[model samples]
Target: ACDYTCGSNCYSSSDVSTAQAAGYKLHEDGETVGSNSYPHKYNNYEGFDFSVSSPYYEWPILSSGDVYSGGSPGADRVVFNENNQLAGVITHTGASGNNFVECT
Candidate 1:
């Protein structure tokens, strides 16, 4: 299995101490890749929206520095700036059968 950590300068996916030490802990849903169902607050949205799938996940609106970046084998990493603004995207090709990450 691949240790998919959305990239952290001080955290290692295999080492729990680094993350915990930094006041960072994996959300229960985020522990298992492709088995996530976390609710996230969206910009200009009434409340929140939920993301799902096996290790299917979404980054929470960060505290002003983090970027929204995550995706599985068949998804694209659509980026939404902290200001709820669109900042370019890394286009994705189908893994198969026209699969695409729907970000709105």
Candidate 2:
């Protein structure tokens, strides 16, 4: 279980933009899982995203300056399932708005 950054700093603004342009969802909060029957309660603007089936049982999106050199530089924490599929992601605007995720 390794930790990595997402969004601009991790990949470059252009790369992130390119991904978004290629039919990829920006992964916002309140995204409905399946048939809108179940909605994610976490705030997309302040929390991370993850799938319920992912093996990453314990994952957290620490504040930017908490560990990395840059302090809360708006970055997304993207997670992957055991099948290497995208589980979910956590998006933060800055260090002050960071949070954690525990995928069950």
Candidate 3:
């Protein structure tokens, strides 16, 4: 509302960089807390309308140690855990990606 142009999707591009460092990402569903083009919506966002949005993002919590890293290329990493979301990022620096089944 203060600086975000699109009501609750106020995630500025600046936030994108910050989030990259924090491990947050865009929702796979195309959902967004990103910036907007319409500034007028800022005021009337909820003042005269209704919308459902959040300032949070959906980035994976798993990485090299236990991620679903598979597909093509050469070297790959994989993760395996029922609670992968909170499993713990040991080598994520530490991170994740795709390629061959080195661990995929």
Candidate 4:
């Protein structure tokens, strides 16, 4: 069973953890990758209820099951906070434009 659903993609907790680990490492080091500079500020414009506190950052959670490394990030992301807690998983699949919706 899928732990989280991002449109057509499904993810397990381990996948989220793996992606978050990479993102948080770069975040702690004050580094970024990709053109949009992922591990970037999420801004929470969609106003999703995240159990963890902000300032939150968004990192690409790939459907290919590989950690993001400065390339096409697909549409899914794992959100985390400054405390390194998982906020939630989000995706650009269902939402319009540049906005995002929470993974189920």
Candidate 5:
């Protein structure tokens, strides 16, 4: 019953939406946390076909079912655009190194 599957992790639509909302709020306020400064620009180096427009930002979608505050980002993410629209879910779980593959 997974709405989206990132590698072995499962996420529903509510999960994505909740995560996106938190990230977007930070983006609007121009605030960021963690060492890497998340909700940062994504750049789309992998060139995945996303319906939403950029400049996109990447935010960690924790597997613990908690909104990402700080610390280890795990592998899964929810990408959103400037218009606050969800582009897609991605993960580094199956990809090489830091590269990400779209969740299906």
Candidate 6:
């Protein structure tokens, strides 16, 4: 089995000056609609191909208070809300001798 490291935390723009400076500029202008459709079959175990439908929307810019800080050395996991909004973050500190488990 493969060992997986998990990190949990949250970061806001305040935590990162560069990110705050960028503001909402990171998001593309206008409504961007997209969709994903696929089909596939497997033997023994079969997986269904899920389709994704999205409407044009901009991700909320992280505020200075929205950024999470890295207390310990580890990987960072960022999550977004359905509205493409900032949700939270996960910071995983790999175990000893398993530094690669965490994001560098």
Error of 2 at 61 (Å): 13
Clashing residue pairs, candidate 2? Answer: 48-90, 49-88, 49-89, 49-90, 72-95
lDDT of 5 by residue, 48-76 (tens): 99998889999999888999999999999
Q: List the residue pairs that clash in candidate 3.
A: 66-79, 67-78, 67-79, 91-94, 92-95
Model 2 per-residue lDDT tens digits across residues 1-104 = 22334433344333333332221222333222223222222334333444355343112233332322223323444344434355554444334544543322
Model 1's lDDT to the true fold? 0.28
- Compared with the true structure, what per-residue lDDT tens digits does model 1 show for residues 1-104? 32322222122232322322221123433342223322232232212232221222223322122332333322323333333333322112322443332322
- Candidate 6 per-residue C-alpha lDDT over 19-52 given as tens digits, one digit per residue, 9 for 90 to 100: 3222222332322211210000111111212132
lDDT score of residue 23 within candidate 5? 98
How accurate locally is residue 91 in candidate 5, as Cα lDDT from 0 to 100?
96
Question: Residue 70 in model 1: shift from native, Å?
Answer: 11
What is the full ranking by TM-score, best candidate first? 5, 4, 2, 6, 1, 3
Q: Per-candidate TM vs. native?
A: 0.21, 0.28, 0.18, 0.98, 0.98, 0.24
Instruction: Between candidates 2 and 3, name the one with more favorable lDDT.
Output: 2
For residue 82, what is the lDDT in candidate 1?
A: 31
For candidate 6, what is the TM-score?
0.24
Q: Cα lDDT for residue 48, model 1?
A: 24
lDDT of 5: 0.95
The 10 consecutive residues of candidate 3 with the worst lDDT sum are: 37-46
Model 5 ranges with Cα > 4 A deviation? none
- In terms of TM-score, how similar is model 1 to the real structure? 0.21
The Cα RMSD of model 4 versus the native structure comes to 0.6
Candidate 1 minimal-lDDT segment of 10 residues: 2-11
Candidate 3 lDDT, 39-72, residue by residue in tens: 0011212121122332322232221222212232
Q: How many backbone clashes does candidate 1 have?
A: 5
